[PDB]
Design a protein around this nucleic acid. Structure first.
Lengths: 44, 121, 53, 111
RNA sequence: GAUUAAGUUAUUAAGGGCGCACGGUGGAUGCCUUGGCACUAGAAGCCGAUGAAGGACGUUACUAACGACGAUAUGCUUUGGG
RNA sequence: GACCGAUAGUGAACCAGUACCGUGAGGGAAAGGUGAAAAGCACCCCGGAAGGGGAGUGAAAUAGAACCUGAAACCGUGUGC
RNA sequence: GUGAGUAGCGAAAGACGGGUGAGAAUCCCGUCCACCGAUUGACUAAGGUUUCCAGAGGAAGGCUCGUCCGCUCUGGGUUAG
RNA sequence: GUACGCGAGCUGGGUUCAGAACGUCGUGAGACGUUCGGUCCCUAUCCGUCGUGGGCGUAGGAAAUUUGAGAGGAGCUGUC
RNA sequence: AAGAUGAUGAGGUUAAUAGGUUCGAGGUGGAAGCAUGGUGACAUGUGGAGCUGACGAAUACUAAUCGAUCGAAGACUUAAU
């Protein structure tokens, strides 16, 4: 059996990272709700 | 089939050969009850080969003993086959049977095993 | 298969009437002057006294 | 006149202790030291080490002799648990209750 | 207290039941407030290319975290209160 | 303030959007109280140490950091019928 | 709490002599014995982020025990034309 | 007759699941006679049953040997 | 000789209950070493040989040691003696 999380340092940043949030417009609404709710970590 | 021990009929043959050749050396060992109600039935059939002193019996005893080596004869080697036919088989040359005894120590800690001490009489 | 009822405190304490340990069966080691378990050697100084061990 | 020595929160269970404390109750103190040194259970040296504190706090600081002492009461109460888990099959988990106990030995001298 | 029969009623407690006494675990209730919520009156309603809101890394004699601070860093200069 | 008083009132009185769960957007609890003053148990004794019992501080430690009061369930030891 | 001191303890060869210790079938050293050997052996990517190493620890974690440790305290460890 | 006795004793061939094909009916999605394939779960608390031990009672305490109140078992039959 | 454990039964120094030991019965079917034959494989003779777990006898050489706990004193009433 082969599970559903095969970790990678590059695809984790090229997809969920900071500069892929600020790329589009709806990423800047995601980052507008995680520094509003008061999270410690904005972007994984 | 004298008495099984929880070993798989192949280990019990090569377990008694690890208690016999370490009892002619140390002259006493500390072990469980049922591991030493059977090794009195082996090492007393093996000093009997010591009282003969043949050529057949120096070979026919070697198939139930290991080949270990002893150092302190004041720095002279003595294989465990040669410790018998020797200082063991000459101490008992006028005692017909009954070479061992079993002294019950106590239950050991954390296993509940009735420990005994076997020693050559 | 599961229990059908909750077994009570009367039925529980009855079932462990026979759940206990027995006395060791001691002696008096007559040379040192202690207690030892019979047919065994002494853990202190002590002879077997039929064997002097 | 009577003494005691309470040991509390010992790592052992509370039902496996009171089989051994059941065995020595109402007996002479000279024997009961040497019954706990012949039984092969797990709570015998623990109970023994606290019986030899009710036999040293009855000779020191009350100044009574340790040849006449008798165990009046000896009882094991219950102390707080330590809930740890055990990962069990098909994504479940069962709770394992490691219990602790309080042990109290009280000696006497018939007065 | 037996000599024989006939006939009666007990004591036992391995353990259990009810009452009382004395202990442990457990954190309900009682009594408090550092924190909240709901609203009146006066202010007030913008900061950012002279680099913002939010941040990572750093700073003490010895610093793990929050506090306040930025290689002039657990603070510096000056005008007033005390 | 004819509003709440630690399962209440904010999710949050404890260094909270934090442990922790999710690849991701996102979900999210648990926590409070020694005494008026730390005067927080010097020294002896059993112990390998824990934990105890005396002596001491205190109005009280049967308030010793499992720290105010301490209910029931549930586990104990004793005794009259 | 009852179920209950019941079901389990996660493939598999250990035996003894010596030390150590308050404590040893389990820790360390020795001899004999068995098991893999197109691998249970030897180097590097992916991923994890101090685990590696020496000195002290035994409350918790380890399906038992423990003097032991991939767990706790102190002090160290990664060198390029 | 006993849940057409008995699946916390066994079987799952069958009947009644998702796939597929024929005949036929339906303009259509699909449907009622045959066909090939198709996961059968549980650590026994109480009554019941089969075994086998402690406690106390039978007016003193013990070693053996027995009467049988009652209750079980057995009961078939060919050929020369 | 009985058996899941407890029970039943054979024994505890006045001792044959197990182990060893010396004798057998059953089982296998010619041990090793040397001597002879042959180029060697192997064959013959010393020898119904040697090895032999559970069944039958024999002898205290080894272990059943020293010891401990429970266990009677015989109720009353009425007709017989």
């Amino acid at each position: 059996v082969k599970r559903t999380y095969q970790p990678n340092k590059r695809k984790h940043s090229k997809v969920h990272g900071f500069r892929k949030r600020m790329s589009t417009k709806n990423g800047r609404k995601v980052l507008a709700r995680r520094r509003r709710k008061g999270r410690k970590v904005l972007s994984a | 089939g004298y008495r099984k021990l929880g070993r798989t009929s192949d280990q019990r043959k090569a377990m008694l050969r690890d208690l016999a050749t370490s009892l002619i050396i140390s002259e006493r060992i500390e072990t469980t009850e049922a591991r030493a109600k059977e090794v009195r039935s082996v090492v007393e059939k093996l000093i009997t080969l010591g009282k003969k002193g043949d050529l057949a019996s120096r070979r026919n005893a070697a198939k139930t003993l290991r080949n270990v080596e002893i150092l302190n004869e004041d720095e002279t080697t003595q294989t465990a086959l040669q410790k018998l036919f020797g200082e063991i088989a000459e101490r008992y040359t006028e005692r017909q049977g009954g070479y061992t005894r079993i002294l019950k120590q106590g239950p050991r800690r954390g296993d509940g095993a009735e420990s005994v001490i076997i020693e050559l009489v | 298969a599961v229990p059908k009822r909750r077994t009570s405190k009367t039925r529980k304490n009855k079932r462990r009437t026979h759940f206990k340990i027995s006395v060791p069966g001691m002696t008096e080691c007559p040379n040192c002057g202690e207690y030892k378990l019979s047919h065994r050697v002494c853990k202190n100084c002590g002879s077997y006294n039929g064997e002097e061990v | 006149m009577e003494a005691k020595a309470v040991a509390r929160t010992i790592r052992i269970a509370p039902r496996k202790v009171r089989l051994v404390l059941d065995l020595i109750r109402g007996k002479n103190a000279a024997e009961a030291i040497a019954i706990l040194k012949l039984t092969n259970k797990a709570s015998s040296p623990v109970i023994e080490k606290v019986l030899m504190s009710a036999l040293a706090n009855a000779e020191h600081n009350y100044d009574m002799n340790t040849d006449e002492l008798v165990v009046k009461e000896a009882y094991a109460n219950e102390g707080p648990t330590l809930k740890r888990f055990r990962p069990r099959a098909q994504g479940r988990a069962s709770a394992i209750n490691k219990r602790t106990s309080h042990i109290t030995i009280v000696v006497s001298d018939g007065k």
